[PDB]
Amino acid sequence: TLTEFELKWQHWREECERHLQNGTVHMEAVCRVLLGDEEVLLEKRDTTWYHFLVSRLLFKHPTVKPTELHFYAQ
Amino acid sequence: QLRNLLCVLDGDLLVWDAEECAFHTVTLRGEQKLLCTNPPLFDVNEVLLSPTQHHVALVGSKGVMVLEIPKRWGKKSEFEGGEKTVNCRTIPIAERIFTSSTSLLLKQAIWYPSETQEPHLILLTSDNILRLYNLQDLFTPVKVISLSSAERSYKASLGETAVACDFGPLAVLVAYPLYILYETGETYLMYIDLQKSNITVGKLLGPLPMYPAAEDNYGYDACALLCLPCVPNIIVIATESGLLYHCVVLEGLIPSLYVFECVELELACPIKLHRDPICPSRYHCTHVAGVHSVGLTKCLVEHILCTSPIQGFWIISDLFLGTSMICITCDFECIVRPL
């Protein structure tokens, strides 16, 4: 149930990346996000520090480890 | 991902089709479709033919199902007398455990090596529990063995998971030695005897003394174990990095593992190990990048196939067909090579 989700997620991210490559500003940025791109997640950090954290995790690290959450938050 | 979705039965190639939930059969010496009456609710990663050749286990990370192989009859010895589509009885194993526990993964399934007994199936799960099932009672395991030190498993809670297990030849304590590999490279031994109705399982005893002691713990990357059927027992431990440790099992009394050789596969990656039924000094390694053949003479490593992950691998040893390896890639390219 977990590994299966992971592989589907990987496939979707591959598809999004391919679409981005083919296209190469707003949907550009949105699919920048759907992959978890650190810059575009930074340039519109305008809500809070924890909001930033949550967005970052959701996109960059869909699987979250409770033990390393402290480092991520710092 | 690397998978093993094919097997060979009596000179028929069976190829699992996940979309149709069926085996396609080809008589190598004639196309039939063996349809599952109850389709698997999980992605099949491996197909295991029973020692009795009457059952096929469909194995996935979230479940196991056994298909009952239909009877052969008629002039050509075809399934159900040569019907194009044969409805096969399928029986889910341990379904309640995988449905109740969203985090529980099957690490490996293996058949108990006895041909004369009812085929017993052993399930290794990510909680460090070995569960032994009989095909008569598939809801309740006949035996449950926790792989914690006898002083979730405490070890599984520490992150030490058992990854692979394999049977050695019948040994006088007569029982089958089961070797069990942890992700840490730690190997344990247990004796299993199945006498008709009573399952005698020995204590877990895995204090194998590495010869030579590891300077840095055999990486947290140990992925497969293979026992070669020889005396003394030779254990092959494979890592995700491509290192293969050839360990000779000697008496110490807990037995010790003497590393005779360490062999790196030039892979440029989880490895599956396959015994050669004809050459006991040879085995095959299937991985995402190809097939290696390893011959114990340094060991002779041949990169047979450089890929497109392997979706199925088997060694045919038939009088009429000869000895040949069959490889199927993820793109369904069928590569046959004489061995």
Side-chain angles (χ1 to χ4, degrees), chain A residues 1-24 29 36 47-74, chain B residues 11 18 22 30 39-40 51 57 60 63 70 74 81-82 92 94 109 113 119 141 150 156 159 162 164 168-169 171 175 177 185 202 206-207 209 212-214 219 222 224 229 232 238 242 252 255 268 270 277 280 289-290 295 309 312 322 338:
Chain A
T1 71
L2 308 171
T3 60
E4 194 176 1
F5 160 75
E6 182 60 38
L7 54 93
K8 296 171 177 176
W9 200 81
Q10 290 168 176
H11 172 71
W12 163 82
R13 189 172 182 177
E14 293 165 355
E15 188 179 2
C16 288
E17 191 177 354
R18 192 198 312 110
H19 283 296
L20 179 67
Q21 295 161 356
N22 299 345
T24 305
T47 309
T48 54
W49 82 280
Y50 49 90
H51 192 103
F52 180 53
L53 170 63
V54 158
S55 181
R56 279 184 55 181
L57 291 181
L58 175 72
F59 291 130
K60 306 176 185 182
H61 328 281
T63 56
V64 150
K65 266 294 298 173
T67 310
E68 284 79 25
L69 273 182
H70 178 72
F71 153 73
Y72 281 124
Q74 179 73 54

